[PDB]
Ligand SMILES: NC(=O)c1ccc[n+]([C@@H]2O[C@H](COP(=O)([O-])OP(=O)(O)OC[C@H]3O[C@@H](n4cnc5c(N)ncnc54)[C@H](OP(=O)(O)O)[C@@H]3O)[C@@H](O)[C@H]2O)c1
């Protein structure tokens with residue numbers, strides 16, 4: 001159950017989100033990643049930022065070693081943090097994530113964000129106050145292309161890019177590889193349909209994060225509506241006899257969007273893979289489309 005990427009690699013269309021806030025002890029990511037792979041998840045999303053690549057890699061290696069999966073059947077994503085946008089740091093940042101996970105390659109490496117930060121996770125000046133750096137994203141992308149040339153990243157992509165930022169790269173002279181994907185916040189309240197049409201037009205897969213309405217970490221307005229209590233999602237839930245989460249994920253699959261889903265809960269993890277068992281009608285799809293309201297959680 002995969003989509004073919006513009007470099008000829010395959011990405012599974014449902015993936016497991018691995019971020020948990022720092023209140024969650026690290027070991028938890030080991031345990032939940034194992035459960036995710038047991039339930040049928042094969043695409044696993046992590047990042048230097050999440051401080052979990054050691055535990056996530058252990059869960060992957062544990063399931064490889066006991067024969068539960070082959071390495072070739074796992075799609076593991078990691079991402080380049082913004083203090084490493086300088087080109088000479090890009091391959092060493094990837095190599096560090098590889099050391100931590102003890103994996104030989106990542107299936108996908110992404111530029112985590114278009115923003116550049118002072119090299120050194122969040123460098124802060126004398127009053128606050130994040131220290132930005134000016135780095136041409138196109139020169140970061142070229143160092144990204146070398147990681148794919150080297151086989152350290154099977155596929156390379158971007159995250160949190162808008163259409164102009166995508167075009168900075170697509171319009172680059174001497175361009176060797178398109179990004180395979182643009183991983184962005186995308187759910188029924190902020191559906192990105194304009195960005196989606198753009199990405200489809202360039203054969204770039206859109207990958208939705210916060211598809212279930214985010215973890216609402218209080219560091220996210222607590223007044224924002226709660227996506228999974230949306231009366232449309234719940235009316236669809238009862239009509240199809242699934243849940244609001246599953247309606248939200250299935251909407252993404254039928255629009256050609258690859259969809260992530262974080263859960264640190266055993267039943268919810270198993271539940272999320274039911275997304276392949278049912279479909280939404282065109283009229284369902286249309287009701288969900290009607291929910292777009294430009295609500296940004298993150
Ligand atoms: N590239 C980026 O900048 C970026 C940004 C944000 C996220 N991401 C990636 O995307 C992943 C997912 O996004 P996210 O962390 O915002 O969360 P999300 O997938 O929108 O999940 C939100 C919450 O949904 C709950 N949930 C999951 N399945 C459910 C179900 N069947 N019924 C009810 N509730 C359910 C989970 O809580 P429980 O844990 O309690 O089940 C989870 O906290 C992240 O983990 C990370 O891998 C990337």
Ligand SMILES: Cc1ccc2[nH]c(C(=O)N3CC=CCC3)cc2c1
Nearest residue numbers: 019047049112113115160215217298
């Ligand atoms: C400046 C900047 C840009 C993109 C970013 N993305 C994330 C991220 O990936 N998070 C935080 C929220 C939910 C799960 C994981 C943090 C972050 C910070």
